[PDB]
Design a binder for this molecule. Structure first.
Ligand SMILES: CCc1cc(-c2[nH]nc(C)c2-c2ccc3c(c2)OCCO3)c(O)cc1O
Length: 214
């Protein structure tokens, strides 16, 4: 189907521009922020299910799963959290981050470390440290599966999903890695980053590794 195009709140476009271009050394912090967001979304579906247990039935398994796709230079981070409807994708990713992004950029101006980004509630955008494009594929129990896409420019698209694997419920962040950040496709590197900055996660963190049978 046809994609619909939307404009980001301008301060989010400013933040994306700063992040995709920064020469900040510690780019690996992106993974912590995305694992944190995944964990939060899983918190949300668990909490919602306390009073509406059927909500878990679309995907009873609660997990965070990381899949490198070397041939496409893609890294996927999936969770079986609450997901986002079309309206939530438009709102959560293109609008509500306006306030945090403004305050965070002022902090960056003054010398704050880019790693503080999560404390300003806008850690999602740290993916542009390693990626130049992202598709957020999401399925909420309350809507169809949709794809939100951004290349850090001022507009994003949202498209009903007729091309990706069905998610039972949850979200996949599909990161198209920059040419000099392909280390994040490697098994050893990924495990090293996770072990370092994400030790207290309540959900299993699965790593999908592809190997040749010899
Ligand atoms: C914002 C990026 C993102 C969102 C989700 C997700 N799925 N469903 C919801 C309600 C969310 C979400 C939304 C806002 C947010 C989140 C998670 O983490 C704390 C900060 O702000 C997700 O599951 C993964 C992910 O990377």
């Amino acid at each position: 189907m046809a994609s619909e195009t939307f404009e980001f709140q301008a301060e989010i476009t400013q933040l994306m521009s700063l992040i995709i271009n920064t020469v900040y050394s510690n780019k690996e912090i992106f993974l912590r922020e995305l694992i944190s967001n995944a964990s939060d979304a899983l918190d949300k579906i668990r909490y919602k299910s306390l009073s509406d247990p059927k909500q878990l039935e679309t995907e009873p398994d609660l997990f965070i799963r990381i899949t490198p796709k070397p041939e496409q230079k893609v890294l996927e981070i999936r969770d079986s959290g609450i997901g986002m409807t079309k309206a939530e994708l438009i709102n959560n990713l293109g609008t509500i981050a306006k306030s945090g992004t403004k305050a965070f950029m002022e902090a960056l101006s003054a010398g704050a470390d880019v790693s503080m980004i999560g404390q300003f509630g806008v850690g999602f955008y740290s993916l542009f440290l390693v990626a130049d494009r992202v598709q957020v594929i999401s399925k909420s129990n309350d809507d169809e599966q949709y794809i939100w896409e951004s290349n850090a420019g001022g507009s994003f698209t949202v498209t009903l999903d007729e091309v990706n694997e069905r998610i039972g419920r949850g979200t996949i962040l599909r990161l198209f890695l920059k040419d000099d950040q392909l280390e994040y496709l490697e098994e050893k590197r990924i495990k090293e980053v996770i072990k370092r900055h994400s030790e207290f996660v309540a959900y299993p963190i699965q790593l999908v590794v592809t190997k040749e049978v010899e």
